[PDB]
Symmetry: D2
Subunit: 114 residues, 4 copies
């Protein structure tokens, strides 16, 4: 199944934040309507917040998270959760290796903001 | 129902990170071994990170998040989501007023780390 | 925070299924656009499916689940989760008493169908 | 990533319920500690329940859902959600073709019971 792709409401501000837990440097790309809108990278095994940014979902609302480790795409897992019919989290984990913790880069998208 | 309480595996490292989206200063307390293990405080209307830390879940694994604003307890919402039977997110929203966006402090707990 | 209220896409078929796990008879009502559209009742301590139905979310998309025991409303917990950006579950648990598993009546809504 | 595999608490009863939304007959196998514990088959384009059972998670707590259509394993998507730190849902969708809603068979696992 496709993972790391979320339909947000259009023209809406959202937070995107990436955490690293791997001996390898992670590179996280965030695409809005198929165009790169943010890129984060770092190397930590203790959950460093390698990036965080406010983006606008634009007219399509399409947001896609990709993760790579020196050019090699990682396998993704993802889901969206909604609390009290209002508060939205889109969640991504990624695996660059052999141990299947899926925490090598962890991405959380949240909206609404403000 | 009780909200903002999660049973993690005992004696396990986890990340906790708080974001603010309110005109009011948010105070986030994170309890482990039924004592305050971390306190974050800050104000943003742009999803700023007001705190991030790595903690150990202690003998019981019970982690509780409480949010207050100028001494008033915020109403909480929460859930835990597990991806590929391995990657865990414990999520908290909170409301400090009337508009019911539940984003005034948003708290993300994730594990495993490393 | 409000629980058991979900906004579905308009004019969309969904399934709703109720389980009972209590010594007390559970009454589950499902409302669409603030109108009762399905009712199920029964007593089971073995997860009986006390009812399942296909409904249409209608022009408003508003779906509410209510649970009562002998006319007393039960307290609810709820959340919505989306897999692969397409498969939706709206989840409800309810508590009629003191023991706090919120499993006295459990309701699952799923879409899309067909 | 592996999908449809969940670690439940050991020696705990859980419910499993299966819905179909396809012209192809669906087969759902529920394994406990790598042995078939239940098998459901049926055909519906209207979300009919094709199977429901109460099972015991056994010594390991390992439960696996497998779906097949015409003897071919379907692609799965899955996640576990926990409400109020007590009420558990393990959720599976499956795809037997290309269409990508992952609703051809939908499986819901819930615990605790009783
Ligand atoms: C080389 O393996 C990568 O780094 C290790 C130290 C672990 O974080 C592992 O999960 C990750 O896939
Ligand atoms: C005064 O209200 C508080 O601050 C406003 C700027 C909004 O963030 C609102 O959600 C919050 O409850
Ligand atoms: Ca790894
Ligand atoms: Ca790792
Ligand atoms: Ca607010
Ligand atoms: Ca706010």
């Amino acid at each position: 199944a496709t993972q790391g792709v979320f339909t947000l409401p259009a023209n809406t501000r959202f937070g995107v934040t990436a955490f690293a837990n791997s001996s390898n440097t992670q590179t996280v790309n965030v695409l809005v309507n198929n165009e790169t809108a943010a890129t984060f990278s770092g190397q930590s095994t203790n959950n460093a917040v390698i990036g965080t940014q406010v983006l606008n979902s634009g007219s399509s609302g399409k947001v896609q998270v990709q993760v790579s480790v020196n050019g090699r795409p990682s396998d993704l897992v993802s889901a969206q959760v909604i609390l009290t019919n209002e508060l939205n989290f889109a969640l991504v984990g990624s695996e660059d290796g052999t141990d299947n913790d899926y925490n090598d880069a962890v991405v959380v998208i949240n909206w609404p903001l403000g």
